[PDB]
């Protein structure tokens, strides 16, 4: 009657590769980290912003995307653990969700890295408003 659950999917992922020639700063690797929906799902309907926390060696290490694409592209020396906050267009709780993203590079002369990590979010009894956003994004009713 009143109750519903809505699930949506996020994909966090990254690519990393060894540069053929280090940058003049001597950066050895290009990487790119992202949050996206699965194809035919528009997470922008319910995602306010994504906040990527780079290693504090990076200038302005707190990177915000308020619209898609939610990604950071960098060169650097090493991998690190990257906190990632996904903020929702929700007037209620919860307003966001945090992830500990493992941003690892290809050590030695390993082939380049191409990782994906699939996260299912479950929203219980969302407001009709926020519910409209979740379902618009390709969210699904369950329970
Ligand atoms: O690539 C990195 N930063 C790029 C950059 C840009 C501009 C200036 C400077 Cl100085 C650096 C970077 C990445 C990771 C790092 C790091 C720097 N220093 C320690 N770490 C963790 C190393 N630990 C990882 C697990 C064990 C060691």
Measured distance CA(60)–CA(124) in Å, rounded: 36
**CATH fold group of domain 1-143:** Immunoglobulin-like (2.60.40)
Task: Name residues whose C-beta falls within 8 Å of residue 105's C-beta, 6 or more positions apart in sequence.
Answer: 16, 18, 29, 31, 78, 79, 113
Among 34, 41, 31, which Cα is nearest to 13's? 34
- Contact 101/84 with Cβ under 8 angstroms? yes
Say how many Å lie between the CA of residue 76 and the centre of ligand 1. Answer: 7
**In units of Å, what resolution does this entry have?**
2.3
Helices (H), the chain: 128-136
Q: How many alpha carbons lie under 13 Å from residue 127 in its C-beta half-sphere?
A: 12
30, 32, 55, 74, best to mutate for ligand 1 pocket (most atoms within 8 Å of CB): 55
- DSSP-derived letter for residue 56 is T
Say how many Å lie between the CA of residue 78 and the centre of ligand 1. Answer: 5
- Contact 76/27 with Cβ under 8 angstroms? yes
Ligand 1 within 6 A of CB of 76: yes
Task: Name residues whose C-beta falls within 8 Å of residue 69's C-beta, 6 or more positions apart in sequence.
Answer: 34, 36
């Amino acid at each position: 009657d009143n109750q519903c659950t809505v699930q949506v999917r996020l994909e966090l992922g990254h690519r990393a590769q060894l540069r053929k020639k280090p940058t003049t700063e001597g950066f050895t690797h290009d990487w790119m980290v992202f949050v996206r929906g699965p194809e035919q799902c528009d997470i922008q309907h319910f995602v306010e912003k994504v906040v990527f926390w780079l290693h504090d060696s990076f200038p302005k290490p707190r990177r915000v995307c308020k619209e898609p694409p939610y990604k950071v592209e960098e060169s650097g020396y090493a991998g690190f653990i990257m906190p990632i906050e996904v903020h929702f267009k929700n007037k209620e709780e919860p307003r966001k969700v945090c992830f500990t993203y493992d941003l690892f590079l290809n050590l030695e002369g390993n082939p380049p890295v191409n990782h994906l990590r699939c996260e299912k979010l479950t929203f219980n009894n969302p407001t009709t408003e926020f519910r409209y956003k979740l379902l618009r994004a390709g969210g699904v009713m369950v329970m």
